[PDB]
Amino acid sequence: SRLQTAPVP
Amino acid sequence: SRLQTAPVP
Amino acid sequence: GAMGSMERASLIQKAKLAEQAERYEDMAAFMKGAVEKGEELSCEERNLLSVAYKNVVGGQRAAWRVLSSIEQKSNEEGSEEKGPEVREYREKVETELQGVCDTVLGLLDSHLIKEAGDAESRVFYLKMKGDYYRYLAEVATGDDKKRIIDSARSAYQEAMDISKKEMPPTNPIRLGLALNFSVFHYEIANSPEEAISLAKTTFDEAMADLHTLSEDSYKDSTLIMQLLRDNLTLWT
Amino acid sequence: GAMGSMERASLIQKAKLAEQAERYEDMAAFMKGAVEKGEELSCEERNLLSVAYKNVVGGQRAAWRVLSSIEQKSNEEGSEEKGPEVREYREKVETELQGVCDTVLGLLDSHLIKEAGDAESRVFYLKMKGDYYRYLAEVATGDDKKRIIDSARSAYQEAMDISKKEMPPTNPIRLGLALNFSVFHYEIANSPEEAISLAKTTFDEAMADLHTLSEDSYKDSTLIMQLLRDNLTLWT
Ligand SMILES: [Ca+2]
Ligand SMILES: [Ca+2]
Ligand SMILES: [Ca+2]
Ligand SMILES: [Ca+2]
Ligand SMILES: [Cl-]
Ligand SMILES: [Cl-]
Ligand SMILES: [Mg+2]
Ligand SMILES: [Mg+2]
């Protein structure tokens, strides 16, 4: 992967 | 598939 | 318009950057600006114009289909009535799509087609005219629909007549034109037999000319031929 | 503004339609209009607002990264100088991104945050404030950059303090806040050890509270926990 941030529904 | 038309580069 | 102060070469450079960034609305505005400089377009530039508007109108078409489907479901018996909002928003998207189509058709009429003398350019532009009238047809209702369909058909026919006289059966532009006119016949003009006939004849005539091609040209032609085959498989 | 004449319920209905159609710029305009009606937002409505702007700014961020990379390549030694166009177009995209961020921050300041009394709403909005300052930080240069970073940090901290006092360690909003603040530390504030510490502690405290959850809540929490784990795997 790369870094991930919070998903949006 | 479904129907296809011409692609664009 | 707003691109009036930018150099033609800078507009083309930025169109290429916008393609890389997947910023297709920007790409279309840059290429509209380039067309409005009034010089004919090169083969590469014609492709940039086509890529830009196809991606913009493609987004609109997809959204319109989603909304039309929801709308049609709401107008079934036993559907709880939820007010005017679905129809309103579908009409908003529809109007924006019609506007993009009208912009492209405007560019072709003022003055890309009339200044196009070579077969490769004239066929490209006439195919595009057919395509954008066909996109208008997808959303049209009634008598407007009849005249729009005739306009698409007429543009496609003119392109076909030139392409048959002036281009080899393996030419990608000729193949893509035939592919799209065949879909026109099947989906818009309610002529599935004409669609199937056109796709088959186009495929078979290209097959018999492949022997003349270089490895790279062979790859370009066979890619579009496979699209004809895929449609024929669906239709028969 | 332009949504001033549309009912609040109609704006929310159309936001949902625009989500289905993947028309996120429209979705954002509808939700801005709903916020400007001046009533607090429900949990579902807050999610629609977040979805809309995250998709808009995400497109801009992706495009900006593409353009920044091309720009940086052009400013290497032995790079043929091609004029101002790359910098110009990167600045255009950058300005549009800054404008979206400023619109969101404006909505939070006028007056979503001050009217948010419950922890679930206040933490949501303060996280969003942190996020949109962080997006501004990604493109900022120099002294502006320092104040923008401090603004992001302050918003995230305030959110963390509330979430720790008022929400369980498995709460999805609390988990997503911690995920994003950890990325802030790693990517923006040049504090990789703080990033790793925050992600680890957050993960371990959620793990120990999973036993309290229903099957559905368990699924929601473990999804975000896996994101913390994925980052930790990259970083260590
Ligand atoms: Ca000039
Ligand atoms: Ca000419
Ligand atoms: Ca009202
Ligand atoms: Ca309140
Ligand atoms: Cl509307
Ligand atoms: Cl620009
Ligand atoms: Mg209409
Ligand atoms: Mg700037």
Numbering used by the authors:
A (entry chain P), B (entry chain P): 241 to 249
C (entry chain A), D (entry chain A): -4 to 231
Which text from the study accompanies this structure?
Among the numerous protein families facilitating PPIs, the family of 14-3-3 proteins stands out due to their ubiquity and high conservation across isoforms. These ‘central hub’ proteins hold a key role in cellular signaling networks, as they are known to interact with over 1200 protein clients, and are involved in pathways related to metabolism, apoptosis, cell signaling and tumor development. Protein interaction with 14-3-3 can yield a multitude of effects,8e.g., the structural stabilization of the client protein, the masking of functional sequences, or bringing two proteins together. In this work, we developed and validated a deep learning approach for predicting putative protein–protein interaction sites between 14-3-3 proteins and phosphorylated client proteins.
Our approach was applied prospectively to identify putative binding sites across medically relevant proteins (ranging from highly structured to intrinsically disordered) for a total of approximately 300 sequences. The top eight predicted peptide sequences were experimentally validated in the wet-lab, and binding to 14-3-3 was confirmed for five out of eight sequences (Kd ranging from 1.6 ± 0.1 μM to 70 ± 5 μM). The relevance of our results was further confirmed by X-ray crystallography and molecular dynamics simulations. These sequences represent potential new binding sites within the 14-3-3 interactome (e.g., relating to Alzheimer's disease as the binding to tau is not the new part), and provide opportunities to investigate their functional relevance. Structural characterization via X-ray crystallography further substantiated our findings, revealing binding modes consistent with known 14-3-3-client interactions. This includes an ‘open’ binding mode, where peptides bend out of the 14-3-3 pocket, an ‘extended’ binding mode, in which peptides occupy the entire 14-3-3 pocket, and peptides featuring a disordered C-terminus. The identification of such structurally representative 14-3-3 binding motifs, without having provided such structural information to our models, testifies to the strength of our deep learning approach.
